[PDB]
Amino acid sequence: GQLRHNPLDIQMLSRGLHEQIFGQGGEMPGEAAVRRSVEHLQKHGLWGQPAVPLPDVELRLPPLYGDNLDQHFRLLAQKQSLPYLEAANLLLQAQLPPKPPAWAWAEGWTRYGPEGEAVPVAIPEERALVFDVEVCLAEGTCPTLAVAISPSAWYSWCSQRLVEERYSWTSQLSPADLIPLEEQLVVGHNVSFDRAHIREQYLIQGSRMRFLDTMSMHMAISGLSSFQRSLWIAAKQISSWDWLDISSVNSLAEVHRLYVGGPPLEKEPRELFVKGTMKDIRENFQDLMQYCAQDVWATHEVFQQQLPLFLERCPHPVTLAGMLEMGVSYLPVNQNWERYLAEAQGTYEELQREMKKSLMDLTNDACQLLSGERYKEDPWLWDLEWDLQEFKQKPCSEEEEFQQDVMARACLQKLKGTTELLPKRPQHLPGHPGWYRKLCPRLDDPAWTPGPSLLSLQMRVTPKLMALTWDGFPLHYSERHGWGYLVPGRHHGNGPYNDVDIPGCWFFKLPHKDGNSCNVGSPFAKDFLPKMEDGTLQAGPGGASGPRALEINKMISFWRNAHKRISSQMVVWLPRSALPRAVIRHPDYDEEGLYGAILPQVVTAGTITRRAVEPTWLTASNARPDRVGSELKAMVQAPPGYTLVGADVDSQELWIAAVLGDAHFAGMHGCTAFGWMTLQGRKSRGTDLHSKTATTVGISREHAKIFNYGRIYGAGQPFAERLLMQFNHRLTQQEAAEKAQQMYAATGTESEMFNKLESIATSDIPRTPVLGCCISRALEPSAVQEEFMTSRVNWVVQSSAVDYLHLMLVAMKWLFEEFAIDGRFCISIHDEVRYLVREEDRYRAALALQITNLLTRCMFAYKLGLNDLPQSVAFFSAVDIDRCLRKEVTMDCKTPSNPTGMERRYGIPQGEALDIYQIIELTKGSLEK
Amino acid sequence: EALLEICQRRHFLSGSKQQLSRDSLLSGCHPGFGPLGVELRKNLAAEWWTSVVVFREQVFPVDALHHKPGPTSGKLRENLLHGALEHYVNCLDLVNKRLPYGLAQIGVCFHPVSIGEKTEASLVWFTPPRTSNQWLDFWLRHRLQWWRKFAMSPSNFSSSDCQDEEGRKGNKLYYNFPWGKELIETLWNLGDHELLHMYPGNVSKLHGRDGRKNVVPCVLSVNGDLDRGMLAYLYDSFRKVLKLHPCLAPIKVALDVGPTLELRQVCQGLFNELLENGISVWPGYLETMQSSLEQLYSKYDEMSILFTVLVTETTLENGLIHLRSRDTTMKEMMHISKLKDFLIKYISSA
Amino acid sequence: EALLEICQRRHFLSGSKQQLSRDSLLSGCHPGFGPLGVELRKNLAAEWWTSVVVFREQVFPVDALHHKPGPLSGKLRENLLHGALEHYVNCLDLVNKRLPYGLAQIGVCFHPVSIGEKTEASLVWFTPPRTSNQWLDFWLRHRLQWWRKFAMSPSNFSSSDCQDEEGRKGNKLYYNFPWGKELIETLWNLGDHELLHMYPGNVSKLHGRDGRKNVVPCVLSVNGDLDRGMLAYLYDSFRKVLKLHPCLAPIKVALDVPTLELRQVCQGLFNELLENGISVWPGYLETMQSSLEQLYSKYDEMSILFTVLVTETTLENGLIHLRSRDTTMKEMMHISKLKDFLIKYISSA
DNA sequence: CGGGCTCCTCTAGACTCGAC
DNA sequence: GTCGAGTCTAGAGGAGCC
Ligand SMILES: Nc1ccn([C@H]2C[C@H](O)[C@@H](COP(=O)(O)OP(=O)(O)OP(=O)(O)O)O2)c(=O)n1
Ligand SMILES: [Ca+2]
């Protein structure tokens, strides 16, 4: 009988899988523990509920090397990261001669021997390096120069665009435009940036070179939170301050001052590589290369001072293997990327000019109120600058017609020469008022556009121009209390404020989505669209003029804040020779198309929870039918012959907290009420905790995620009420409070989770309950006392999720290497893992990912001592097999910039989301070919 | 009815109220437009040409005769599509048999109502069948943006997908006139049926190049009404002001004088300068029946005149001339030397 | 005959070679014009407009329909005079009851031959009888100067004086085509007879201010043929080279050609030249390439002022080969000075 | 007491630098 | 030698992600 049950009647893992994973010899929880669990469940009214059995799964799992799961994972990770630890130790035992006085002015790589002799080499040809790259920002994204430190000799790289002066270089980057490098290890401060300039890193096939980062290890050892970073910077210029002397911000100067504490680091004041041209770099070549070498040496010293501490506080090899695997992200693109950029920019400009037409018309119609001093009668525009400046002052015959024309031209020319009388500096619209002057660009601007083109909804005069009103009251801005409205008099919403002291008026702030403490900075936020539609917020012109402004603001808000990031993404277009034969021979291959890749500049550990941080691709919005350019991730399209096979873990932090609470309570699954509730539920039936919450309260499932994860980590009942009122407008203040008490005072259901989290948090040396990784030195109780409590309690679960990601990466790499699965790691979001696999091995990759999830869940159970795993969370709900990258395999990504969808505008079809029961039938249950 | 009376008073629409029935204007039974109306229509034609033919490497002008002889006598044309399709084989030689390429033409067509005359702009866009829907969507977006970017209320320019009696895909462009939405531009994704009927026999002549593939193009036909478009822009523009687009205003600048002989020569020199620049100027220094400044301002506002240049006694002292815009109603003191650059920049950057 | 073959090949004239004949071209019954011919006629219309309506405060456009309704059962128009005469009353209010004024128009006129459509540039000048012949001579001289401005051999643009049967002074402009002299324009002094016939009685509406007194002006007809003018200029401009005047030539510069980066440079130059108002033939789009002599011959037969070539050396220094249609002298100049050079060359002539 | 991140635009202050 | 136009930094508020 494959079906198994625990003393709590929860369906456990199948008998075959349990025997393959846990073997035998487990210890029973004991009569007392079972009695306590039954008593708790009956007290919370959950012991009598039944459950429908799930089909059993029989798998011939790959042979685990060790005696149990932990030893197996340790062996896998040691095999994966053994050469790179050796390279790091080689760096730890390196002595170099002083940096050469004369840097080589030659294209390519130069090797510096003793005394400073420069020898040209093709590649550094080393196993461990310290790498820094300098890029001329004003010229483009092509690397300018780089200096590398090897244990034997120095290395310096100069580009063809720095030694040779040319009229114009190609703006489409190529592998021939990158730095030629490459079992090798490269160490850098923000090595992700320096990794993106390596020629061989953009190949579709993977490489054995891994990258180590100084910021990531700094965050692992003695990192700081965002609030902690702010406090640290403020102190450099909460009653606990012992954390200051052992922590620093990710700036290389501060990190070197912390871990080394030598002379202060020297920074160039000119910043030529950022605010300079190529000529300045050519003139100051020696100084810039010396600065680069100094930065490389400082990074080397910091790495030497950091690596032993990182190995001490993160002794599990899986941590290092997952940090190395997380730094090889790879996002393929094509000419559709360029077309998407063009279409998004065009749609953004069209909507921008559509809004600016109405804004400029309203402004121009307001200049007439200057005449007759009629602005004193306008409630919206009685406090602007209407003053006007004075200008600064220090049948004729052929012969007759020609003479008349010449005389007129000469008279005009004579009066044309009076330009010397007026001042050289042209005055900016002296005639028009000051508020109108501030909104107009000057003629010297190369991008001058007629009229008040420098206007947007975000400015402080736009609501006054549009005569926006709240419940029949004109909007009023208070610098102390943000926006609001004026009620005539001398209504109770958001309370009055006497600080404005407006004669015969009252000031009430607009309702902010985050409470009375916050201030509204603009009435055009997404939260005010329902109020505009309802009628509380109205425009003076009325009709569709008002709501359309907010609609367009919502549509173009994301692109406005992300066009610089998305357009400046470093894309390197691989030529036909560099592409594999499989891509070329595939029917979908296009001769006239482009095939390149974008390497995300991922900081592996940019969080105190050791999470990753990428400015764009970890902030990339999903496709929506309203936001302009929201199909950003959908433009990451696999090359011909390749598919993006990946999946998302289901209810990660909920399960981690539940298993921790259970293990604290009793060595069984589903002991506490919260653990039992989390396990009892399927995603195909809509009865999981997120779906159950989305049913109980009318908010969406994402809002349910926000609500649950807030309630877990210390959100109060007022926060719950505000969230419910924000994401469901049908609820009133009294009605929303009823549902807040229904899920907060009725919890204890989650008492054991809180007990375990506060036990780990208040420990002198907090450690991850799975891989044993320690918290940052600036968060231990000896340094922070009772402060940063919420951050520390959330750190346990978040770092457990990071350990989950590390385990997933290690297991996936092991399965790919062992069974010869043709694919590579694509990108990992905080709980997602995408792998660029060939079309012929998509189902093998899906089965490998299912096995990886099963192994990771079993590891989480075993490291806590539960000695078993429920069947409910033993496999992925569905593994996505899609050509492009999107949240769901069925969304067609309709956008204001992509109205026809991905199927019509491009050639992207819809993929499939398959469960284990289907993957097994598709691949006969074996990963082998 | 205020718009029609203002058009009559400022010579946009000729005739009395009897001939200015909106049905007559829509049908084309009205008499010809006034000189300002002619200038507005010419500005619309110039902008359409700049957007369609000039900035496209594959769109060429074409000349189709106003009458179609033969099968029983000849007839006057009702569409520009037939004449442009008659030149497909000849114009294949220009682009070296490469697709897509277009033939454009702005002309007058006659349809029964009484014969109503309409100024129409056409674009026959020969495309391979593979991307015919993509090109239809692209041209829909492009023409809709072209109509919207000269409009104070672009929301009144709309689109509507439509199917022909044969099921051929197409789109229709409308403007929200005060009475209702009237069709002003129609894009049809006509197949090769028209080309095959007009060129019976071997299909070797019609073979265009889709990359490296020979194929018979799919006739994407775009037809737009310029008289109704001009009337729509007059309604859109309409203190009584006709806020026509700066690139569509019939009169860019009106020069007036506020020393009779010397100021006459100064204004004459400025007139000749702005004219040679390429800016049409309304002479406001010749009207013997002078009026107050406010009446002149109202008259220039109703005429869609962008700028009123004033040359005064102080101009001879320091070269400063008053300049009032139609938008803010504020004038600015600017030197004579800088007037031509400012006007050119204002027109081009609009 | 060679010129007509070149025009047909180079898309100055549309239709088959058999259809295109001298009589059909002179009668308006030809199949039509090619894109180059359309642009040449458009340049002619623009120059005529600048010469007549522009630079004058007394000349206005005319909007006359193609058909005349009412009893003579409407008919296609035969001239643009009737529309101007019908607009006479309103144009008096337009000029604020001043005098004189004009009503010039360019449009398609229908003449029986078949149906012959000609593009005619007319000029209806309303002047008081005090200064009739003075304005007639002024218009004659200005029109002859305009015709001779673009001519390589302005001696072929003749002018003659002819008297009609009614007994009214008139002039007839001509061009000396190789086969003979053909009428390209004609001036008449018709008088007030047509306006009186079209407005019988109530002469108070027709009164205009000739200074202090009120007079009914006469009618002056200055009617030319822009199609015949286009043919005359083509014949005057004809090594097979069509040396058209820069203000009339349809295409100014031909741009030709690492395919990708050269294409990008050519696209940037093309965009700049188009934005600055210079028509460019995009010859760089053609993957197929022939001898540079063939390209030069093609661009010469298309009346293209200059041929610009972007090569590999351009990326390094920015220099581009430039070939002149008139002088056949090649030179190297920086690609950033081409726009200003072309603008200066056009403005010079 | 939600947590951990990302970056933008706008406004104010400080500063400087040139023009008269 | 005073003062207005750039310049730069910073802080706030908004908005993407998990
Ligand atoms: N507002 C949020 C959103 C997310 N997370 C954390 C908790 C999750 O464990 C992790 C992954 O994000 P998801 O939203 O994907 O969480 P789930 O994986 O549980 O979502 P689902 O399982 O429904 O796909 O991010 C959080 O703490 N707070
Ligand atoms: Ca998940």
Coordinates of C-alpha atoms in Angstrom, one line a residue, chain A residues 176-399:
Chain A
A176 CA 34.0 41.3 -30.2
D177 CA 33.2 44.5 -28.2
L178 CA 33.6 42.8 -24.8
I179 CA 36.5 41.9 -22.5
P180 CA 37.9 38.5 -23.3
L181 CA 38.2 36.2 -20.3
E182 CA 37.9 32.4 -19.7
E183 CA 37.2 26.0 -13.7
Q184 CA 37.8 29.7 -13.1
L185 CA 36.8 32.1 -10.3
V186 CA 36.4 35.9 -10.7
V187 CA 36.1 38.1 -7.6
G188 CA 34.8 41.7 -7.7
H189 CA 33.0 44.2 -5.6
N190 CA 29.9 44.5 -7.8
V191 CA 31.1 41.6 -10.0
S192 CA 27.7 41.4 -11.7
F193 CA 28.5 44.5 -13.5
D194 CA 32.0 43.4 -14.4
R195 CA 30.6 40.0 -15.4
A196 CA 28.3 41.6 -18.0
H197 CA 31.4 42.8 -20.0
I198 CA 32.9 39.4 -20.5
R199 CA 32.9 38.1 -24.1
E200 CA 32.2 34.4 -23.3
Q201 CA 29.4 35.1 -20.8
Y202 CA 26.8 35.8 -23.5
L203 CA 27.1 32.4 -25.2
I204 CA 23.9 30.3 -25.2
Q205 CA 25.8 27.3 -23.8
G206 CA 27.0 27.6 -20.2
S207 CA 30.5 28.0 -18.9
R208 CA 32.4 26.8 -15.8
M209 CA 33.4 30.2 -14.6
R210 CA 31.7 31.4 -11.4
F211 CA 31.8 34.9 -9.9
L212 CA 32.2 35.9 -6.2
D213 CA 30.9 39.2 -5.0
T214 CA 32.2 41.4 -2.1
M215 CA 28.9 43.1 -1.5
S216 CA 27.2 39.7 -1.2
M217 CA 29.7 38.4 1.4
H218 CA 29.5 41.8 3.2
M219 CA 25.7 41.4 3.6
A220 CA 26.2 37.8 4.6
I221 CA 28.7 38.6 7.4
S222 CA 28.0 42.1 8.6
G223 CA 25.3 43.5 6.4
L224 CA 22.8 46.3 7.2
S225 CA 19.1 46.8 6.5
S226 CA 17.8 49.8 4.6
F227 CA 16.8 51.6 7.8
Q228 CA 20.1 50.4 9.2
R229 CA 21.9 51.8 6.2
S230 CA 20.1 55.2 6.7
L231 CA 21.0 55.3 10.4
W232 CA 24.6 54.3 9.6
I233 CA 24.9 57.1 7.1
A234 CA 23.3 59.6 9.5
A235 CA 25.7 58.6 12.3
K236 CA 28.7 58.9 10.0
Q237 CA 27.7 62.5 9.5
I238 CA 16.9 53.4 18.8
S239 CA 19.1 53.2 21.9
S240 CA 21.4 50.4 20.4
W241 CA 24.5 51.6 18.6
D242 CA 27.1 48.8 19.1
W243 CA 26.2 47.6 15.6
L244 CA 27.9 50.6 14.0
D245 CA 31.5 49.6 14.7
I246 CA 31.0 46.2 13.0
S247 CA 29.0 47.2 10.0
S248 CA 29.2 49.4 6.9
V249 CA 27.3 50.2 3.7
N250 CA 28.1 48.4 0.4
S251 CA 30.4 51.2 -0.7
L252 CA 33.9 49.8 -1.3
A253 CA 35.4 52.7 0.7
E254 CA 33.3 51.9 3.7
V255 CA 33.7 48.2 3.3
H256 CA 37.5 48.5 3.1
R257 CA 37.4 50.9 6.1
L258 CA 35.5 48.2 8.1
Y259 CA 37.2 44.9 7.2
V260 CA 40.7 46.3 6.7
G261 CA 40.8 49.7 8.4
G262 CA 43.8 51.2 6.6
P263 CA 44.2 54.6 5.0
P264 CA 41.1 56.1 3.6
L265 CA 40.3 55.1 0.0
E266 CA 41.1 57.6 -2.7
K267 CA 38.2 58.6 -5.0
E268 CA 38.7 60.6 -8.2
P269 CA 37.0 64.0 -7.9
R270 CA 36.5 64.4 -11.6
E271 CA 34.5 61.2 -12.2
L272 CA 35.6 61.1 -15.9
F273 CA 34.1 57.7 -16.6
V274 CA 30.6 59.0 -15.6
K275 CA 30.6 62.8 -16.3
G276 CA 33.3 62.9 -19.1
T277 CA 34.0 62.2 -22.7
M278 CA 36.4 59.8 -24.3
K279 CA 39.0 62.5 -24.9
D280 CA 39.2 63.1 -21.2
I281 CA 39.8 59.4 -20.6
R282 CA 42.5 59.4 -23.2
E283 CA 44.2 62.4 -21.6
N284 CA 44.0 60.9 -18.1
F285 CA 44.6 57.3 -18.9
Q286 CA 47.4 56.7 -16.3
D287 CA 45.4 58.3 -13.5
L288 CA 42.2 56.4 -14.3
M289 CA 44.0 53.0 -14.6
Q290 CA 45.8 53.7 -11.3
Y291 CA 42.5 54.3 -9.6
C292 CA 41.2 51.1 -11.1
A293 CA 44.2 49.2 -9.8
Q294 CA 43.7 50.7 -6.4
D295 CA 40.1 49.6 -6.3
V296 CA 41.1 46.1 -7.4
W297 CA 43.7 46.0 -4.6
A298 CA 41.2 47.2 -2.0
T299 CA 38.7 44.5 -3.2
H300 CA 41.4 41.9 -2.9
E301 CA 42.2 43.0 0.7
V302 CA 38.5 42.9 1.6
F303 CA 38.0 39.5 0.1
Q304 CA 41.0 38.2 2.1
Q305 CA 39.5 39.6 5.3
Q306 CA 35.9 38.4 4.4
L307 CA 36.2 34.8 3.1
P308 CA 37.2 33.1 6.4
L309 CA 34.3 34.9 8.2
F310 CA 31.8 33.9 5.5
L311 CA 32.9 30.3 5.7
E312 CA 32.6 30.4 9.5
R313 CA 29.1 31.9 9.5
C314 CA 27.9 30.0 6.4
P315 CA 29.6 26.6 6.9
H316 CA 27.2 24.6 4.7
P317 CA 28.6 24.0 1.3
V318 CA 25.1 24.4 -0.2
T319 CA 25.1 28.0 0.7
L320 CA 28.3 28.7 -1.3
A321 CA 27.1 26.5 -4.2
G322 CA 23.8 28.4 -4.4
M323 CA 25.5 31.8 -4.1
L324 CA 27.8 30.8 -7.0
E325 CA 24.9 29.4 -9.1
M326 CA 22.8 32.5 -8.5
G327 CA 25.4 34.7 -10.3
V328 CA 25.1 33.0 -13.7
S329 CA 21.7 34.5 -14.7
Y330 CA 21.0 34.6 -18.4
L331 CA 18.0 36.2 -20.3
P332 CA 17.8 35.6 -24.0
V333 CA 16.3 38.2 -26.3
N334 CA 15.9 38.9 -30.0
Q335 CA 14.9 41.7 -32.4
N336 CA 11.5 41.7 -30.7
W337 CA 13.3 43.4 -27.8
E338 CA 14.2 46.4 -30.0
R339 CA 10.7 46.5 -31.5
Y340 CA 9.2 46.3 -28.0
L341 CA 11.4 49.2 -26.8
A342 CA 10.4 51.3 -29.9
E343 CA 6.7 50.5 -29.4
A344 CA 6.7 51.2 -25.7
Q345 CA 8.5 54.5 -26.2
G346 CA 6.1 55.5 -29.0
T347 CA 3.0 54.6 -27.0
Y348 CA 4.4 56.5 -24.0
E349 CA 5.0 59.6 -26.1
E350 CA 1.5 59.3 -27.7
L351 CA -0.2 59.1 -24.3
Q352 CA 2.1 61.8 -22.9
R353 CA 1.2 64.3 -25.7
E354 CA -2.5 63.3 -25.4
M355 CA -2.4 64.4 -21.7
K356 CA -0.2 67.4 -22.3
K357 CA -2.6 68.7 -24.9
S358 CA -5.4 69.0 -22.3
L359 CA -3.0 70.3 -19.7
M360 CA -1.6 73.0 -22.0
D361 CA -5.1 74.0 -23.1
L362 CA -6.1 74.4 -19.4
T363 CA -3.0 76.5 -18.7
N364 CA -3.4 78.7 -21.7
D365 CA -7.1 79.3 -20.8
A366 CA -5.9 80.4 -17.3
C367 CA -3.6 83.2 -18.5
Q368 CA -6.6 85.3 -19.3
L369 CA -7.5 85.6 -15.6
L370 CA -4.5 87.9 -15.2
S371 CA -6.4 90.6 -17.0
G372 CA -8.6 92.6 -14.6
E373 CA -7.0 90.9 -11.6
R374 CA -9.6 88.2 -11.8
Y375 CA -7.3 85.6 -10.2
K376 CA -8.4 86.9 -6.8
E377 CA -11.8 85.5 -7.5
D378 CA -10.5 82.0 -8.4
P379 CA -10.4 79.6 -5.4
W380 CA -7.7 77.5 -7.1
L381 CA -5.3 80.2 -8.4
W382 CA -5.3 83.0 -5.9
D383 CA -1.8 82.4 -4.6
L384 CA 0.4 81.9 -7.7
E385 CA 2.7 84.4 -9.4
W386 CA 0.8 86.5 -11.8
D387 CA 3.5 89.2 -12.0
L388 CA 4.9 90.3 -15.4
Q389 CA 8.5 91.3 -15.9
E390 CA 9.7 94.2 -18.0
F391 CA 12.0 93.6 -20.9
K392 CA 15.7 94.2 -20.2
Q393 CA 17.1 97.2 -22.0
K394 CA 20.6 98.6 -21.5
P395 CA 2.3 99.3 -61.5
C396 CA 5.9 99.9 -60.4
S397 CA 8.5 99.3 -63.1
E398 CA 11.3 96.7 -62.8
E399 CA 13.9 99.2 -61.7

